[PDB]
Design a protein around this ligand. Structure first.
Ligand code: HEM
Length: 148
């Protein structure tokens, strides 16, 4: 498929520096939906400001984890049913920490923002479309952790 290669070639650019790009994703995320900030509860404390999250080593590890799951999705872009059972339980885990299904779209928008900023003119509307579909497939799998 032409979509698969668009994903692989765009990801190649981002996967070079995953924390720097991930940090973009999350900064954007908290700008769009500040109420996601309290869900990160390392040492039973809440971040006061988005910038506090950026000084937490656990938070930065979580960014790395995010980027690793996306990398796995990219690698399996030709068949994402292989990740399905993992993504479902990943969904369940996030449901447990207090993530809401409706916040998936914010994460998606954040992902697209990060790609748009990173690729600039290379972020064509076909790249956009490809990534939306990839992201959608991921969310559909994770969503089964709410079962339904
Ligand atoms: C954007 C909102 C999200 C929030 C608020 C959030 C929050 C959390 C929290 C609180 C944990 C548990 C503590 C920790 O491991 O750092 C966690 C774990 C995790 N998150 Fe997220 N997360 C989000 C999104 C994502 C997304 C989109 C992915 C992947 C695509 C991701 C991948 C992971 C992974 C792999 C773990 C470790 C799960 C385990 O095996 O226990 N997270 N997340």
């Amino acid at each position: 498929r032409p979509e698969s290669e668009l994903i692989r070639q765009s990801w190649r650019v981002v996967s070079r520096s995953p924390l720097e790009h991930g940090t973009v994703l999350f900064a954007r995320l908290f700008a769009l939906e500040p109420s996601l900030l309290p869900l990160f509860q390392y040492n039973g404390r809440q971040f006061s400001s988005p910038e506090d999250s950026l000084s937490s080593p656990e938070f930065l590890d979580h960014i790395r984890k995010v980027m690793l799951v996306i990398d796995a999705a990219v690698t399996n872009v030709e068949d994402l049913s292989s990740l399905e059972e993992y993504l479902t339980s990943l969904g369940r885990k996030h449901r447990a920490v207090g993530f809401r299904l409706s916040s998936f779209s914010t994460v998606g928008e954040s992902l697209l923002y990060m790609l748009e900023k990173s690729l600039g003119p290379d972020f064509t509307p076909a790249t956009r479309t490809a990534w939306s579909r990839l992201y959608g497939a991921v969310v559909q799998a994770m969503s089964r952790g709410w079962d339904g």
